[model samples]
Target: GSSGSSGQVPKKQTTSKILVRNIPFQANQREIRELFSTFGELKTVRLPKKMTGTGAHRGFGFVDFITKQDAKKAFNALCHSTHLYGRRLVLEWADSEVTVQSGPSSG
Candidate 1:
């Protein structure tokens, strides 16, 4: 007997990170922080400028919440069901670009 379960895999890598596509293209960190911080505490917002490798069309971003719950909430709320500027926003699971720089959390 094979030890494999249903291969649905509706969601892959259920992590606390998400990629924001079709964004403003105008520096996303602060903007995304403002947008997402409303739901829950965010770890950081990353806008990787790989446009030219020094990129352009800066409409892509990556963000992480302190937990999957927050990311989950924010994802469903914002993904495909929302709009920023004139473009329909898209959010998907993203797990990359970890760093040592932690932001403010005075408690």
Candidate 2:
């Protein structure tokens, strides 16, 4: 059921934060924690244990870093990039609540 393919939406995003998908199953939170730690301080790396039918690693998860800069770096590095386990990463903003930005019009 949990095939690491969910959480896709089309919305205006102004924030720099992002979410990571298509993670390696063999990888755990700590490993992921350390991996992202290189770019910056990570806020959280969450994976639903029960989401998957077999209660196994969903082969995809999210990594929240302390700063948007770090998130952007992680997203840039992993998105469409091949992993050691032959998984292509999918990275994007995790539902940016911010609305679209509009510039002031000159009359």
Candidate 3:
């Protein structure tokens, strides 16, 4: 059921933010931006860096699109479906809608 884009165009997107991981360590904002821009118009690209003063990315990043559809398309098509710099990409919905669970909650 994940095939075909016909009859699925929404008037407006619902969400436009996605979390991306497993990116190449040497990747910079510009490189990542160019990579994801192939999908759709990007609103923002946040590749966080460590506070160690080396300005190294944390091996992950977040991308925001102008439309939820774009974000969804990117997520679906990129999640374990593509590889960059010899590493398989991992994409997920980010922000308040999706929570990043590391392990079982103590509570």
Candidate 4:
């Protein structure tokens, strides 16, 4: 028998961040925000630009809510069930683990 109590791991808290992919390249942050606002108030919307330096959208982005439940609701309501500009949307929970930034230190 194990000496210590069972090695059960505690569940981690989830974040209200969602990763959205397969968005139309023409979609802008305003359009994306308006679409997602149907679920609940959003904390932020991040749309990456093309690496070509043309200021074009990257066709993917992240949407954040203030609550986990709101994120879940958006996930359930939008994941694989919506289309943008004839392309299906892909939605998933964004990695919530905190990551340390690697950059030049000001100090």
Top-TM-score candidate index? 4
Model 1 global lDDT (CA atoms, 0 to 1): 0.74
C-alpha root-mean-square deviation, each candidate = 9.3, 8.2, 10.2, 8.5
Candidate 2 per-residue C-alpha lDDT over 3-87 given as tens digits, one digit per residue, 9 for 90 to 100: 4443446337435555667667776777677777777888877764645366677666677777767777777776646374666
Candidate 3 residue-wise lDDT, 1-107, digit = tens: 44433343444645567888778877778877868889889998888766778756767888888887887777787784877788887886654433455898799
Alpha-carbon TM-score of each model against the true structure? 0.64, 0.61, 0.67, 0.72
Q: Give candidate 4 regions above 4 Å deviation.
A: 1-12, 50-55, 96-107
Once model 4 is optimally superposed onto the true structure by TM-score, how far is the C-alpha of residue 28 displaced, in angstroms?
Answer: 1.0
Error of 4 at 87 (Å): 0.7
User: Best by lDDT, which number?
Assistant: 4
RMSD of 1: 9.3
Better of 2 and 3 by lDDT: 3
lDDT at residue 97 of model 2 (Cα atoms): 38
Q: Which 10 residues in a row give candidate 1 its minimum summed lDDT?
A: 1-10
Give the clashing pairs for model 2.
none
Per-residue lDDT tens digits of candidate 4, residues 1-107? Answer: 52433323544755568889888877888888978888899998888766767757776889988788888888889994988888888897665444556897899
Worst 10 residues of 3 by lDDT: 2-11
**Model 2 stretches with alpha carbons more than 4 Å out:** 1-16, 50-53, 96-107
lDDT of 1 at 82: 66
lDDT per residue as tens, model 1, 1-107:
53433333345655577788778765457778878888889898777655546656576888889888998988888884867767677787764444444787779
lDDT, candidate 3, at 73: 78
